[PDB]
Design an enzyme around this catalytic site. Structure first.
Site, PDB file in Angstrom:
ATOM      1  N   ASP A   1      -1.886   5.518  -5.370  1.00 48.90           N
ATOM      2  CA  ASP A   1      -2.278   4.628  -4.284  1.00 48.90           C
ATOM      3  C   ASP A   1      -2.631   3.189  -4.680  1.00 48.90           C
ATOM      4  OD1 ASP A   1      -3.183   3.608  -1.899  1.00 48.90           O
ATOM      5  OD2 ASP A   1      -4.927   4.942  -1.760  1.00 48.90           O
TER       6      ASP A   1
ATOM      7  N   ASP B   1       0.766  -1.235   0.000  1.00 51.91           N
ATOM      8  CA  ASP B   1       0.000   0.000   0.000  1.00 51.91           C
ATOM      9  C   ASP B   1       0.806   1.298   0.000  1.00 51.91           C
ATOM     10  OD1 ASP B   1      -2.054   1.832   0.185  1.00 51.91           O
ATOM     11  OD2 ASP B   1      -2.262   1.591   2.365  1.00 51.91           O
TER      12      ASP B   1
HETATM   13  C1  LIG Z   1     -13.464  -2.025  -0.278  1.00 52.12           C
HETATM   14  C2  LIG Z   1     -12.207  -2.822   0.091  1.00 52.12           C
HETATM   15  C3  LIG Z   1     -10.911  -2.011  -0.081  1.00 52.12           C
HETATM   16  N1  LIG Z   1     -10.623  -1.659  -1.511  1.00 52.12           N
HETATM   17  C4  LIG Z   1     -10.218  -2.772  -2.424  1.00 52.12           C
HETATM   18  C5  LIG Z   1      -8.852  -3.409  -2.064  1.00 52.12           C
HETATM   19  C6  LIG Z   1      -7.676  -2.424  -2.126  1.00 52.12           C
HETATM   20  C7  LIG Z   1     -10.715  -0.364  -2.084  1.00 52.12           C
HETATM   21  O1  LIG Z   1     -10.766  -0.229  -3.307  1.00 52.12           O
HETATM   22  C8  LIG Z   1     -10.743   0.877  -1.261  1.00 52.12           C
HETATM   23  C9  LIG Z   1     -11.820   1.793  -1.434  1.00 52.12           C
HETATM   24  C10 LIG Z   1     -11.887   2.994  -0.680  1.00 52.12           C
HETATM   25  C11 LIG Z   1     -13.041   3.949  -0.881  1.00 52.12           C
HETATM   26  C12 LIG Z   1     -10.856   3.277   0.259  1.00 52.12           C
HETATM   27  C13 LIG Z   1      -9.768   2.373   0.447  1.00 52.12           C
HETATM   28  C14 LIG Z   1      -8.721   2.709   1.434  1.00 52.12           C
HETATM   29  O2  LIG Z   1      -8.947   3.356   2.453  1.00 52.12           O
HETATM   30  N2  LIG Z   1      -7.459   2.245   1.140  1.00 52.12           N
HETATM   31  C15 LIG Z   1      -6.329   2.333   2.085  1.00 52.12           C
HETATM   32  C16 LIG Z   1      -5.719   0.911   2.267  1.00 52.12           C
HETATM   33  C17 LIG Z   1      -6.742  -0.146   2.628  1.00 52.12           C
HETATM   34  C18 LIG Z   1      -6.851  -1.322   1.843  1.00 52.12           C
HETATM   35  C19 LIG Z   1      -7.811  -2.301   2.188  1.00 52.12           C
HETATM   36  F1  LIG Z   1      -7.892  -3.391   1.439  1.00 52.12           F
HETATM   37  C20 LIG Z   1      -8.679  -2.157   3.293  1.00 52.12           C
HETATM   38  C21 LIG Z   1      -8.559  -0.978   4.063  1.00 52.12           C
HETATM   39  F2  LIG Z   1      -9.363  -0.803   5.117  1.00 52.12           F
HETATM   40  C22 LIG Z   1      -7.612   0.021   3.752  1.00 52.12           C
HETATM   41  C23 LIG Z   1      -5.287   3.353   1.563  1.00 52.12           C
HETATM   42  O3  LIG Z   1      -4.159   3.353   2.421  1.00 52.12           O
HETATM   43  C24 LIG Z   1      -5.798   4.807   1.467  1.00 52.12           C
HETATM   44  C25 LIG Z   1      -6.168   5.405   2.856  1.00 52.12           C
HETATM   45  N3  LIG Z   1      -6.469   6.849   2.863  1.00 52.12           N
HETATM   46  S1  LIG Z   1      -6.924   7.502   4.425  1.00 52.12           S
HETATM   47  O4  LIG Z   1      -7.240   8.882   4.178  1.00 52.12           O
HETATM   48  O5  LIG Z   1      -7.944   6.623   4.917  1.00 52.12           O
HETATM   49  C26 LIG Z   1      -5.464   7.390   5.446  1.00 52.12           C
HETATM   50  C27 LIG Z   1      -5.307   6.288   6.320  1.00 52.12           C
HETATM   51  C28 LIG Z   1      -4.147   6.194   7.128  1.00 52.12           C
HETATM   52  C29 LIG Z   1      -3.148   7.198   7.060  1.00 52.12           C
HETATM   53  C30 LIG Z   1      -3.305   8.296   6.188  1.00 52.12           C
HETATM   54  C31 LIG Z   1      -4.466   8.395   5.377  1.00 52.12           C
HETATM   55  C32 LIG Z   1      -5.482   7.651   2.075  1.00 52.12           C
HETATM   56  C33 LIG Z   1      -5.116   7.048   0.707  1.00 52.12           C
HETATM   57  N4  LIG Z   1      -4.736   5.624   0.832  1.00 52.12           N
HETATM   58  C34 LIG Z   1      -9.719   1.178  -0.319  1.00 52.12           C
END
Ligand SMILES: CCCN(CCC)C(=O)c1cc(C)cc(C(=O)N[C@@H](Cc2cc(F)cc(F)c2)[C@H](O)[C@H]2CN(S(=O)(=O)c3ccccc3)CCN2)c1
Ligand SMILES: CCCN(CCC)C(=O)c1cc(C)cc(C(=O)N[C@@H](Cc2cc(F)cc(F)c2)[C@H](O)[C@H]2CN(S(=O)(=O)c3ccccc3)CCN2)c1
Lengths: 390, 389
Positions: A232, A36
């Site tokens: 991302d 990530d």
């Molecule tokens: C639906 C299942 C998840 N999937 C498919 C698999 C990838 C997505 O497509 C999806 C969709 C949405 C709307 C959001 C995210 C998400 O939060 N990704 C974070 C990683 C993640 C992956 C996952 F598998 C489950 C999760 F819980 C989380 C990523 O680190 C963001 C987070 N942010 S922050 O501001 O919160 C943020 C958090 C922590 C520190 C700084 C900012 C900023 C941009 N980087 C992921």
């Protein structure tokens, strides 16, 4: 290719994330870790959970060190809370080194782990500024570089299959490569173009122009980066600021107007299917994102195909139809260049020179008529004004 | 002769627009609507937006009718995307009537709504020819006149305060009057002079001569109306065609040369301030626009003061200084007689007789030495040649 040991070390898919194998503790405990670039915490399941068939057992590691501090990390999606500590970490299919890094032992979580994803932890590769609880918790990559001679750079080649992968298939299929400390020239074609990392927290970049089938979206470029633009791998879709999303969808609909799709499709909620092999790729437009170049008043562009922004999914009737979901959605936190976009290119995170490189991926999905592209240069003025300031 | 029920029914200011209260649907949903003689679509926010604290909720109106058609309207400024339909509309402080009119339910927008303006919709009062998607979409005023006995005419008295009005102030202050179906004699002084509405699309008029402190700008009069000249309450500034704008600024600078102002000022982007009460109005010239009269070879003029073309704004330091912005800017789509110009006069949009009347406004800002004016007649020839084709 000069890093054969790391080539093809990734598995997974855009919808569930791509992971790399790692070991933690002594003796080493093997775990699959989600790659990530959108966060900065290294965390692993450390207690039983319905979606995990294994987890980190600190009491079995002789090298485990308790930091005596809890941590809570909520993401957009889900969240988890755990206990901080350190231990020896290695990457079997990575550089041949072992480092002591911070590890958040996840004891509780909500909508974080994904059923069937096959990963049990997350590797936040972004900078310390966004690490939780604060920037004093050194991210894994920083520890890696400081404790070894590994160059301060990593590159990612995420490979979407172009079709659905069932449980067995996704477990046996190669999902791409994460080259730690270098660039493997066999993972891309054409040239590598670099865009500056605007600021070191997220891997933030600046988009200066957007086209749909060559037609300028014609918005104030500041809109494209409101309130920021990032690369991302921890997010599936290409997410765009509300106003940019509305303009883009309108244009993409206009370009593909020979076929009418239901609202649920454009909302990224429902899939659309076509008879096996007949997906009308040609009626969908290519999307070009122009990024700030390294030279003054110079930009370059990356162009993605519908094969990238339409995500393959299995039909509800598991029929022989080819189905997909629209992998572009709106955001209220800036542009997010997710996995579906990264799948079209080989991405070089050059932390050392504070820049991100793009080149056409040797594994991007395309057809005989169109290909993804990374082209330049273009004369672009006042690109600095495209960046947003709170 | 007098319409007390409509006097003082407007609020707002030149910089954010003047609006009137209206109700849509059953039961009545109250909304503040921007009065715009520069467009022809009646549209209201119909979905949440950061700048709106209320919007039209179609699902709550029993008289709502879905036209099953979208409509996209891009303006110079911003734009909105909407869904067409009709509903019952009324004006609390207007004629005692209810009309079924076309309403564009705004679902998306880009730089349209204004933060702090207090209005949630727009009332395009111009003609069907420029209505979107096409002229088959009957404008509100046309429906009003067709469904009721209200005379085919309305008049506007936009009142600039002469000083900045803060948030609470602008909400409590009376911004002026919109008299629907008539002319209220208490809103102006002197006589009303009429210029013909050249063509019924925008409220298009023909300017035949321009003066800066009596000095003829001396340009081919066709330049003044290239490619058209309109009266638009939906635009703040007096916008002039590039060539006319450049000549006008040179003359205005020359006239006010005893004091030098940065380019940003003349670009209408930055403000200039003076210690409280010391604004040197007298060094700035009056501007006279001659308009074609109704009688052959006859014209009249309207004279604007710097109290009109210098728009009051609050200093970044909120100090006690009196600050302003130059409210005259360049245009590439013809002359636009905006709000700051309208603030000096009572303007009668006499649709029935295809003409626009001007009279000195009872609420125009001035000083003890000069006043806005509407005077005539003057002998002017070949005025039709001034119009652009
Ligand atoms: C639906 C299942 C998840 N999937 C498919 C698999 C990838 C997505 O497509 C999806 C969709 C949405 C709307 C959001 C995210 C998400 O939060 N990704 C974070 C990683 C993640 C992956 C996952 F598998 C489950 C999760 F819980 C989380 C990523 O680190 C963001 C987070 N942010 S922050 O501001 O919160 C943020 C958090 C922590 C520190 C700084 C900012 C900023 C941009 N980087 C992921
Ligand atoms: C900066 C914020 C807005 N303000 C202050 C508040 C008054 C301005 O001073 C200002 C400045 C400029 C350069 C343009 C406009 C403008 O477009 N006004 C239109 C109304 C409007 C008001 C508003 F509040 C926000 C808006 F989005 C729009 C008006 O209907 C024009 C539109 N055109 S048309 O050719 O597009 C055109 C549009 C539709 C049909 C036909 C022509 C012709 C002259 N009549 C307004």
């Amino acid at each position: 290719g000069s890093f054969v040991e790391m080539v093809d070390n990734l598995r997974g898919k855009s919808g569930q994330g791509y992971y790399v194998e790692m070991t933690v503790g002594s003796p080493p405990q093997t775990l699959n870790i989600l790659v990530d670039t959108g966060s900065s915490n290294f965390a692993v399941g450390a207690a039983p959970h319905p979606f995990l068939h294994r987890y980190y057992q600190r009491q079995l590691s002789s090298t485990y060190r308790d930091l005596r501090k809890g941590v809570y990390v909520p993401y957009t999606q889900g969240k988890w809370e755990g206990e901080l500590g350190t231990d020896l970490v290695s990457i079997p299919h990575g550089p041949n080194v072992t480092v002591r890094a911070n590890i958040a032992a996840i004891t509780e979580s909500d909508k974080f782990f994904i059923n069937g994803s096959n990963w049990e932890g997350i590797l936040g590769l972004a900078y310390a500024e966004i690490a939780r609880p604060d920037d004093s918790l050194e991210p894994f990559f920083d520890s890696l570089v400081k404790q070894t001679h590994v160059p301060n750079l990593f590159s990612l080649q995420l490979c979407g299959a172009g079709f659905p992968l069932n449980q067995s298939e996704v477990l046996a299929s190669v999902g791409g490569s994460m080259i730690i400390g270098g660039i493997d020239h066999s993972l891309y074609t054409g040239s590598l173009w670099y865009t500056p990392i605007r600021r070191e927290w997220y891997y933030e970049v600046i988009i200066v122009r957007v086209e749909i089938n060559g037609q300028d979206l014609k918005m104030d470029c500041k809109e494209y980066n409101y309130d920021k633009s990032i690369v991302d791998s921890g997010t599936t879709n290409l997410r765009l600021p509300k106003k940019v999303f509305e303009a883009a969808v309108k244009s993409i609909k206009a370009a593909s107007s020979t076929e009418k799709f239901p609202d649920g499709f454009w909302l990224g909620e429902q899939l659309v299917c076509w008879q096996a092999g007949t997906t009308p790729w040609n009626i969908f437009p290519v999307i070009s994102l122009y990024l700030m170049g390294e030279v003054t008043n110079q930009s370059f562009r990356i162009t993605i195909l519908p094969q990238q922004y339409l995500r393959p999914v299995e039909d509800v009737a598991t029929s022989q139809d080819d189905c997909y979901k629209f992998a572009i959605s709106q955001s209220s936190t800036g542009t997010v260049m997710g996995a579906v976009i990264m799948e079209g290119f080989y991405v070089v995170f050059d932390r050392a020179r504070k820049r991100i490189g793009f080149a056409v991926s040797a594994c991007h999905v395309h057809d005989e008529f169109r290909t993804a592209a990374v082209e330049g240069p273009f004369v672009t003025l006042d690109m600095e004004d495209c960046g947003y300031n709170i």
